[PDB]
Amino acid sequence: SKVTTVVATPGQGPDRPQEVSYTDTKVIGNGSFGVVYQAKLCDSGELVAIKKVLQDKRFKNRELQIMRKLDHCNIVRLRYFFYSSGEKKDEVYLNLVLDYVPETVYRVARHYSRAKQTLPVIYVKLYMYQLFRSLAYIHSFGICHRDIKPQNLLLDPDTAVLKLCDFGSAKQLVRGEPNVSYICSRYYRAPELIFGATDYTSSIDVWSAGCVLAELLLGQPIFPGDSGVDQLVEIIKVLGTPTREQIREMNPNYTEFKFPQIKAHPWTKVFRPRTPPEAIALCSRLLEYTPTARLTPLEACAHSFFDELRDPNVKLPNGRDTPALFNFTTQELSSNPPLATILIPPHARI
Ligand SMILES: COc1ccccc1NC(=O)c1nc(-c2ccc(S(=O)(=O)N3CCN(C)CC3)cc2)cnc1N
Ligand SMILES: [Cl-]
């Protein structure tokens, strides 16, 4: 039970460093950036994660910049950040200390799928709405996550609160400056990115969210490509070959083979017989080739598949109340404020 103490700036708040003490630190993850840890704050005993990434001096970290300006019930909070050096030579690490949320949609969905069960539709509605809520929030800032996938959706199994995490691929999408095409995890990678587009939009996140919805409905990934290019083949096996005009809207500069001519597969045959009609309906307005065709995250939240969540009597399966789903801020409703009439049901207004 060793106690580590660091001088950390508060996450959102003002640049006033304070000493923060934590203990009980375990490795829990890693990647190309560095290592991820769990720890307990000696103060409040609250659990936290710490993403530790090698940060080159003299050049700013865009994940930190993006995270300092986010504050949303469905996004993991950046509580503190701090620097530290070691294990290496004259290298500086940036540490993000984030709220710890214990579960992920990936692990949940794997447990049902291993037990050959479908995750109940109520959980599908709860997870997907909160994911769409977080997207509406970051997209109103022009920030695009670029890594929506089941492992980056944290869950509290008791409150069913969902929080979006891992902002190591997020970027301010600025109009006219290009962006890299090979982002997003393969299975959740939108088609314009596979077509090499570099002027894509936030709707690549909405494609990803549709892949997750579809995956929850089906109990397995809906487009499991065994490469960056075979991903497109899997997509085509459901949506059929994209029309010449659809290829233009995805990226207006391309010749990728020509693909064999394949008919679109009807959405009803894509899912299992007892799949709810509004789930399939919602899904088909997300998994569209034309990136302007897809729903915005707010419109998705307004979808009728989510109406059970707007019911005043709804409860979680463990008898408890649903998390807070109607406290929209004006920034959240900014893209389409009229949608408030559907999104804040009567029983939830003041
Ligand atoms: C790999 O993680 C990242 C990579 C990049 C950026 C951010 C993150 N993570 C987070 O930000 C974050 N992660 C978690 C989190 C939750 C569950 C898991 S677990 O795999 O289910 N598993 C690991 C082993 N353990 C013994 C049990 C549970 C892993 C991690 C919680 N709260 C967070 N804030
Ligand atoms: Cl909020």
Residue 166 corresponds to which amino acid?
D
Neighbours of 93 (CB within 10 A): 18
> Would you give the DSSP letter of residue 321?
P
User: From 3.20.20.70, 3.30.200.20, 3.40.50.10420, 3.30.390.30, which CATH number describes the 6-102 domain?
Assistant: 3.30.200.20
Among 101, 99, 95, CA closest to 9: 95
Q: Which residues neighbour 136 within 8 Å (Cβ) at sequence distance 6 or greater?
A: 296, 297, 298, 301, 332, 335
What residues does 153 pair with on adjacent strands? 164
Separation of CA 265 from chain center: 27
Angle at CA of residue 164, ends 161 and 346, nearest 5°: 50
The stretches of 223-296 forming alpha helices (DSSP H) are 230-239, 244-250, 267-270, 277-284
Q: Are 83 and 172 in contact (CB under 8 A)?
A: no
Residue 26 vs residues 38, 39, 106, 275: alpha-carbon distances, Å: 5, 7, 21, 41
Torsion angles phi and psi, residue 191, rounded to 5: -70, -35
Concerning whether 147 is annotated as a catalytic residue, the answer is: yes
State the ligand closest to the CA atom of 108. Answer: 1
- Quick one: which ligand is closest to 74's CA? 2
Name 78's bridge partners: 98
Rounded Cα distance, 125 and 307, in Å: 9
| Annotated domain spans of the chain | 6-102, 103-350
SS3 of residue 238 by DSSP: helix
Question: Which of 165, 166, 167, 169 to mutate to test ligand 1, by most ligand atoms within 8 A of the CB atom?
Answer: 165
Angle between helices 105-114 and 203-218 (to 10 degrees): 30
For ligand 1, whether the C-beta of 157 sits within 6 Å is no
Q: Which residue has a Cα nearest atom 1 of ligand 1?
A: 29
C-alpha distances in Å from residue 292, one per residue of 107, 165, 204:
32, 26, 10
Distances 113 to 33, 195, 211 between C-alpha atoms, Å: 31, 31, 16
Do residues 76 and 89 lie in contact, with contact meaning Cβ atoms separated by under 8 Å?
no
Q: Tell me the H-state helices in the chain.
A: 62-68, 105-114, 121-139, 191-194, 203-218, 230-239, 244-250, 267-270, 277-284, 297-301, 307-310, 340-343
Q: By the 8 A CB rule, do 310 and 349 touch?
A: no
Atom number in ligand 1 closest to CA 103 = 17
Closest CA to 162 of 187, 204, 133, 199: 133
Would the CB of 315 count as within 6 Å of ligand 1? no
Q: Whose CA is nearest to atom 25 of ligand 1?
A: 28
- Contacts of residue 266, Cβ cutoff 8 Å, sequence gap at least 6: none
User: CA-CA distance, 292 to 238, in Å (whole number)?
Assistant: 19
E strands, the chain, are 3-10, 18-30, 34-41, 47-54, 78-84, 93-99, 103-104, 143-144, 153-155, 162-164, 171-172
27 lines ligand 1 (CB under 6 A): no
What is the CB neighbour count within 10 angstroms for residue 212?
26
Which residue's structure tokens are 């001096």? 57
Identical fold at 6-102 and 103-350?
A: no
Q: Among residues 24, 71, 99, 147, which one is catalytic?
A: 147
Residues in the chain: 350
CATH 1.10.510.10 fits 103-350, yes or no: yes
Secondary structure class of 7 (helix, strand, coil): strand
Ligand 1 neighbour 164 (Cβ under 6 A): no
Dist. CA 132–CA 300, nearest whole Å: 7
